[PDB]
Amino acid sequence: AVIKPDMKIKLRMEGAVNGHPFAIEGVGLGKPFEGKQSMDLKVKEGGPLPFAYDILTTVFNRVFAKYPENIVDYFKQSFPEGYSWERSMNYEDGGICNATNDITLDGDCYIYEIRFDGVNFPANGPVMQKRTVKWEPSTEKLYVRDGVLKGDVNQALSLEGGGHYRCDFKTTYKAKKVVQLPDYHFVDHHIEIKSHDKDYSNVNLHEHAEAHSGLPQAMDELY
Amino acid sequence: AVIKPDMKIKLRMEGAVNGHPFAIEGVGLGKPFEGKQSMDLKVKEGGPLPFAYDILTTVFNRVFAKYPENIVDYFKQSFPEGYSWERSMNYEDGGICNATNDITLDGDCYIYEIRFDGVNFPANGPVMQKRTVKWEPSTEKLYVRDGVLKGDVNQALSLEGGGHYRCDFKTTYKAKKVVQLPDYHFVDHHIEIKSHDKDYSNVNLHEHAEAHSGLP
Amino acid sequence: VIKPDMKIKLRMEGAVNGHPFAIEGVGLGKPFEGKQSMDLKVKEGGPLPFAYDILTTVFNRVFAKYPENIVDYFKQSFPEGYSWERSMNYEDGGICNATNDITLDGDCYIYEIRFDGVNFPANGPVMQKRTVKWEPSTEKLYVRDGVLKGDVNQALSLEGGGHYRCDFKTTYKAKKVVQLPDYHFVDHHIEIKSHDKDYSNVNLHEHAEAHSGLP
Amino acid sequence: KPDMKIKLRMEGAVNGHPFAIEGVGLGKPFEGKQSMDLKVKEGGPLPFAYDILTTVFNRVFAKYPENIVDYFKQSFPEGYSWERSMNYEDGGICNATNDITLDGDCYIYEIRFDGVNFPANGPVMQKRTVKWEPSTEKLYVRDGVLKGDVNQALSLEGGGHYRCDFKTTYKAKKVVQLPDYHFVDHHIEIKSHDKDYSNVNLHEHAEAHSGLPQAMDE
Questions:
Q1: What is the rounded CA–CA span in Å between residue A96 and residue D86?
Q2: Do C135 and D133 touch (CB under 8 A)?
Q3: I want to staple D93 with a disulfide (CB 3.0 to 4.6 A). Which of A88, B2, B61, D144 is the partner?
Q4: Residue B74: which H helix or E strand, with range?
């Protein structure tokens, strides 16, 4: 079996925010068929991070999403060869982050090679002045274009003093081998930083994702 | 006492697309607590419509949304005074539609006053060429900003050749009277043109909506 | 067909955040000198609760100084005329859609204008009327799929010295088939020279000259 | 001085594929002209349109009259940095940064470039771009730093244009006086290149102005 019920994660992120480079490495594990995962992240270079850690969390794997068999699982199909994705995150105040992830499989551990580059974050904004609290739960929209899978969702960070700071996500998912393409569908996400020290040198990060097909006659009419 | 399990709708939309004016009137009904509604629309002016009818359906009332006790219902609370909304629909090929709706209540019947204006639709695009089929199901996202309720959601129209045509929705909801504001929440929507004549002069439109709080 | 001295007559009907208004204007200009002026009067919806500056660019490319160097799409379109559609996307989410159907009767261009703006926040510079003037700008014109397009990032200066940006997307459609120009620019300068307290009366000026970029 | 030297190193990736480029150049800052030769050291042959990098390959090479405060010439010898997002109309996005220092008469650039979501069938990946049209960048002050905004366009082979929205932030390393709202006309040209663009000779010309003026030309 290519995907086991308990798999491991190893990653290294190299990047920059507003021109200032940094590097972070992480080790984790998750349940691909339950859509749950967790990891411990450590800042290796550029610490203490001068920006909101929240802008990186969604960059720190689609295979960790619970897909019903009614909907084709593009990502679980892509293994053992793996897949890659590119993402642009356009925040409403002009800050923009571009990120890439090359995902491979080694035994039962997923390996990420991540690049992250954010620019145009204003000094007085919530990212530079580290005013974010958490990502709100979100519903990602998946669709096929040019034979690859695309991901579109407008996200929102809850802010310190209340209110929300929005970000437009545009993701392209590319399997390394030929796989079957899914129909238009959704994936609900919930990402949470469970623990951290002051300068976010150590971060414990949790993610939970479930695919669905939108407003249904639902299945909860007993049995 | 204000909203009954069965209410009615009467509406008139006046607008233009790429400078060509049109007018549409509709009558319908729905169940606010079940989040379902239906209506029959008719083209009164500007027919036959030279653009895809689907760009108007989401303009043809969140009061017809199933709200759990979990979430404050901004819209049902806004009556009998009613509420209004403004919306911008930014399609990925540059077409932009601006819409407003002034919603009042007369007895058991909702009255909509709708204005609709779309521009910069290219002649070879799916809207002017009428290549759309149905809005994909969507999850509308609602949040508070500067004391008013806002709606942000990237929608998608499925196209005839199987492709998809995306649109960014930005809605502002304003209650006529001071109403308690809800927390961050969602509303799943499913809208369908169930029946129509050849020229879309007659359209029977159904919508179904249920609010929720995202992945728990 | 186009005389050195022409006149302008227009009526704008529209709404901002759902509140309707109507404005009528009469003006004068010199198409070959790229200058024009007009007096506008609010007929309905006054006093206007929004910044008047968001309407001035909607209140005619034919009033642009074109060299021999560049094909003049707009002067060619007459006597049949042309129309245009425009979206104006302000950086705080406010967006205005406008159309203008321009015809010619004798010396006078006749505009039929529709204007609709939504999602302007109550605390923003438009609803608070904190705008001063449009900065002069360079509009880029190009052909796409047989139509002439108008693209430019504008900016309104604010009372406290700040700037409020807006992205213009314009489509120009001649009533009859004309020859399309190549990629070029049009510099703009638009000014409200005079007005009454609530902008019931506005005197507006515009100056435009086409060019083909850094030589 | 009227004649300066340029040294740069660009490291980056497009759609996840890394590449590296080095360049040496020279220009006339007070005349708003500059030239350089660029060489690919890693990631060649480049699988994307070279035109997306040229505008990343220094506003100090812009002719500013005494009419307008020169934010960029003021920032030296300490130098300045800039960040830029380039939003192409088909979804492709490039983020770029440049840290500019001065060693004698030679400018040294530390450049990072990252582009994503370029479609396989688009003009960047299919390499169907010709050149950037001349443009007019508009510069203004926000939160004490200088901003650059301009919607630009690339011509394609079979005719037509492929648009890109530039948003640039310029940050001087020392305290300098801030300019008023103004413009800078720009024209960028690849004067020569070999088949796989592994070597490129690149020219740029820039002049600042204040918009439609009583015009001085008389």
A1: 10
A2: no
A3: A88
A4: helix B74-77
SS3 state at D30: helix
Look at residues A127, A130, A11 and name the one whose alpha carbon lies nearest to residue A60: A11
Q: How far apart are CA B166 and CA B160, in angstroms?
A: 14
> Which one of C140, C142, C191, C209 makes the best mutation probe of the D interface by having the most chain D beta carbons within 10 Å?
C140
Q: Are B166 and B154 in contact (CB under 8 A)?
A: yes
Experimental method: X-ray
From B70, B73, B60, select the one nearest B33 (Cα to Cα). B73
- Chain A interface test: which of D11, D52, D95 (most A C-beta within 10 Å): D95
Sign of CA dihedral D207, D210, D213, D214: negative
**A213: Cβ contacts below 8 Å, ≥ 6 apart:** A70, A71, A183, A185, A186, B137
Nearest to C88 by CA among C20, C22, C165, C18: C165
Q: What's the resolution in A?
A: 2.2
Residue D73 DSSP label: H
Q: According to the annotation, is C211 in a ligand binding site?
A: no
Residues B110 and B8: beta-carbon distance below 8 Å: yes
Angle (CA) C191-C194-C196 rounded to 5° is: 130
CA C144 to chain centre: 21
Asked if residues D202 and D34 have their Cβ atoms less than 8 Å apart, the reply is no
Amino acid occupying residue A101: N
CB contact under 8 A, C213 and D149: no
d(CA B193, CA B135): 9
Of C18, C114, C171, the CB nearest to B117: C114
Q: Is B196 annotated as a binding residue?
A: yes
Strands B109-119 and B7-17: parallel
Q: For chain A, after which residues does the C atom lie more than 2.5 Å from the next written residue's N, i.e. where is it broken?
A: 60, 216
Phi then psi for residue B183, to 5 deg, are -85, 175
Q: Does B114 touch chain C (CB under 8 A)?
A: no
